[PDB]
Amino acid sequence: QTSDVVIHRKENEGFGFVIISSLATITVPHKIGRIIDGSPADRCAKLKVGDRILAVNGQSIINMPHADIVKLIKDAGLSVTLRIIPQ
């Protein structure tokens, strides 16, 4: 049940979601832990606060460290696409 969610932000704000990683074939270390109120992740509202992300901008991140995913989204631009799983 992998639903794909694009997140459009402005240049003044961020996407407004926090990724929590746990530190690997059947492992999903990264998920959503919180959502900043009044953020594009809150307005798009397609993210639940327990969604395990499989990929970021069409790039598998299950075997990717936390810092690399942060750097990936940090350069992603004003739109990012997460492949997620609800919870």
Partner: peptide
């Protein structure tokens, strides 16, 4: 825990 990383984006 100590083996976890939270960072907002």
């Amino acid at each position: 825990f100590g083996e976890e990383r939270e960072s907002i984006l």
